[PDB]
Design a protein around this ligand. Sequence first.
Ligand SMILES: OC[C@H]1O[C@H](O[C@H]2O[C@H](CO)[C@@H](O)[C@H](O)[C@H]2O)[C@H](O)[C@@H](O)[C@@H]1O
Ligand SMILES: [Mg+2]
Length: 244
Amino acid sequence: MRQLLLISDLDNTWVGDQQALEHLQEYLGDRRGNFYLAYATGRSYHSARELQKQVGLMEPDYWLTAVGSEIYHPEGLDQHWADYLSEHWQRDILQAIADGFEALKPQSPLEQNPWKISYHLDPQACPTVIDQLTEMLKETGIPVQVIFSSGKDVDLLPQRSNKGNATQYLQQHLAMEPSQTLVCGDSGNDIGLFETSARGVIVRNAQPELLHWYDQWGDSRHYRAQSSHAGAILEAIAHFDFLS
Ligand SMILES: OC[C@H]1O[C@H](O[C@H]2O[C@H](CO)[C@@H](O)[C@H](O)[C@H]2O)[C@H](O)[C@@H](O)[C@@H]1O
Ligand SMILES: [Mg+2]
């Protein structure tokens, strides 16, 4: 029932340039009832909440955390989404396979959850190892996807997950159309967002892998902003003529 469903990643997108973050929030703070806000981050809910306290993030309506593996409503964790992601998911088998790659090192326990297995790629290892991992994981028949970003972060998630799928789920939940949606991102863990039919903005300070993706799949609904960080969101809002 609102005119815009705003979905944005935090670090390097919404966050990173405190001045832009502040004027973006001032602008939005003057028409809060005209849009639904969702932060789609690779951070866990707890970590996202810490960041909010650090930079003064305005309160969103929803939190799509851990790359969309967990969805938080004002009233709490979405148990439907969790059960949906659990179906056919085999965390242990996938972890055993990933653990076997010498070039991969497990990320801290706090970066893991039932639907997210994460690792760090050795800086000296050949990125091609990600292709081998992906193919090996897929051949298990287990519905899994591999998210690679910043040239080092590797997340193993259910195929039904990632930021884009969480976004579409939210869109259906709120009865919001793709033409009324704006997704904002900066890296490989945001590709799922640009895969949806929502309008999208790629920040100027975007990571290599996301720019490469845009070059190959970029369409008319995708906008490459001149501005970096939060400034890219204001620019996109004006570009797509949202909140007219
Ligand atoms: O910007 C916050 C942190 O982002 C990284 O970690 C998050 O995003 C990754 C990509 O999805 C996940 O794999 C990881 O588990 C998340 O915590 C980055 O690597 C950290 O250095 C940043 O502080
Ligand atoms: Mg990102």
